[PDB]
Amino acid sequence: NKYKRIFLVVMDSVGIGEAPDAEQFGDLGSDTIGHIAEHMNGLQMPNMVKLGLGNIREMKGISKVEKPLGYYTKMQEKSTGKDTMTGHWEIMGLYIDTPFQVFPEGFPKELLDELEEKTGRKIIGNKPASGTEILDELGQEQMETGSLIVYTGADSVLQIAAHEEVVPLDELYKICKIARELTLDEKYMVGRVIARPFVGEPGNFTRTPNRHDYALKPFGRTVMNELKDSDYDVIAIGKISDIYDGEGVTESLRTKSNMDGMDKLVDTLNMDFTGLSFLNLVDFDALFGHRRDPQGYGEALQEYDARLPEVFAKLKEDDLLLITADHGNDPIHPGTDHTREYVPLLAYSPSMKEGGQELPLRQTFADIGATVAENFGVKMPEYGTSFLNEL
Numbered sequence: 001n002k003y004k005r006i007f008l009v010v011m012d013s014v015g016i017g018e019a020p021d022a023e024q025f026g027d028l029g030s031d032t033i034g035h036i037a038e039h040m041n042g043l044q045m046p047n048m049v050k051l052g053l054g055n056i057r058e059m060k061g062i063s064k065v066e067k068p069l070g071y072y073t074k075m076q077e078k079s080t081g082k083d084t085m086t087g088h089w090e091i092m093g094l095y096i097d098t099p100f101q102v103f104p105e106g107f108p109k110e111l112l113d114e115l116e117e118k119t120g121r122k123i124i125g126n127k128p129a130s131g132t133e134i135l136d137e138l139g140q141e142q143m144e145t146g147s148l149i150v151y152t153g154a155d156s157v158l159q160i161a162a163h164e165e166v167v168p169l170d171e172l173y174k175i176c177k178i179a180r181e182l183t184l185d186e187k188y189m190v191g192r193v194i195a196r197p198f199v200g201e202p203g204n205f206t207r208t209p210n211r212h213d214y215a216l217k218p219f220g221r222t223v224m225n226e227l228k229d230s231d232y233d234v235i236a237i238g239k240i241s242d243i244y245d246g247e248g249v250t251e252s253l254r255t256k257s258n259m260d261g262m263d264k265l266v267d268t269l270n271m272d273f274t275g276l277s278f279l280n281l282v283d284f285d286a287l288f289g290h291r292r293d294p295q296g297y298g299e300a301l302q303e304y305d306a307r308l309p310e311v312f313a314k315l316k317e318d319d320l321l322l323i324t325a326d327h328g329n330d331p332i333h334p335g336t337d338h339t340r341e342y343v344p345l346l347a348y349s350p351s352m353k354e355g356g357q358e359l360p361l362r363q364t365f366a367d368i369g370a371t372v373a374e375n376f377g378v379k380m381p382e383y384g385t386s387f388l389n390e391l
């Protein structure tokens with residue numbers, strides 16, 4: 001093996017400007033990092049800059065450097081959708097024709113009718129909302145009628161809330177599994193179905209840790225599957241295991257924040273493994289992009305950048321660090337959906353003694369999966385061109 005360990009970091013939703021097919025998605029003008037940089041009157045990301053971020057694209061506060069620490073380029077998405085699952089599945093070697101859907105106006109009547117018909121239960125709500133807001137509004141009605149609160153959010157999700165003392169937890173899970181089956185349908189293909197049990201009394205409802213997520217398996221065996229099948233370590237950090245429904249994962253480390261994510265990354269640097277450590281930093285997407293909060297997004301990017309020198313210090317000669325994103329989510333864009341953007345790619349190993357150079361633009365996110373597969377000598381994905389030899 002060229003590299004004993006590969007550290008792959010997805011900065012979730014951190015796009016680097018509209019992709020050539022942005023118009024199809026209503027995403028003309030989108031630019032996640034660029035608009036944030038402008039809002040911040042110059043982004044302070046000196047460590048990403050040292051890696052070559054400004055060499056990919058110069059933006060306010062983000063300038064090119066003569067000798068980038070590693071190699072740099074951007075990647076174009078080939079799959080139809082701009083959702084988290086599509087982006088991650090593509091990164092790990094797949095091509096996804098069928099997009100997952102988002103539902104800003106709630107779910108189609110046909111889906112909800114069928115869910116009632118299979119469960120013998122009434123459905124109420126049917127709109128985007130946070131868990132606190134929807135429970136405040138409908139929690140009492142739910143308790144009194146035994147109905148099911150169905151709701152969505154900014155992402156591709158179908159959420160079902162029921163009081164634990166009115167709808168037995170085990171029944172709520174059965175209902176969610178039925179909904180998971182009904183949503184395997186391109187007319188209304190949702191990324192995940194989520195059980196949202198809650199307890200308490202009107203004016204004091206709280207969601208319990210009995211939450212359960214029902215994910216789809218990737219539409220293909222991924223590079224992660226191949227690594228796991230060859231007895232390599234595949235350490236998933238943050239939402240990674242959920243995103244892939246555990247496929248190809250040997251260890252999973254839950255995180256509660258971006259900084260906790262960087263702490264777990266550090267934990268894996270301190271582990272003797274051979275294979276892949278795969279981190280998703282989700283705050284960018286969940287707290288800032290969808291909420292259209294460029295200030296919060298800018299601050300999070302700066303907090304993340306400040307953590308990188310410790311990572312640089314810990315990387316061994318036979319370690320490779322890969323930093324990318326899975327789509328854009330421009331916090332100064334109309335609506336609440338993701339944005340169809342190129343994503344940055346930075347590839348750094350301390351063994352790169354004379355620094356990096358520009359890579360040819362990656363025609364699919366699957367170039368990452370191809371590179372990882374080639375490094376570890378496992379079956380090459382059907383899509384993607386390795387850049388291993390360029391490093």
Ligand SMILES: O=P(O)(O)OC[C@@H]1CC[C@@H](O)O1
Nearest residue numbers: 129130131132153155157194
């Ligand atoms: O319902 P919450 O707590 O406001 O969470 C928002 C989204 C819904 C599911 C996950 O994407 O997080």
Ligand SMILES: [Mn+2]
Nearest residue numbers: 025026027333
């Ligand atoms: Mn748009």
Ligand SMILES: [Mn+2]
Nearest residue numbers: 012013084326
């Ligand atoms: Mn994402």
Ligand SMILES: [Mn+2]
Nearest residue numbers: 084155285290
């Ligand atoms: Mn999202």
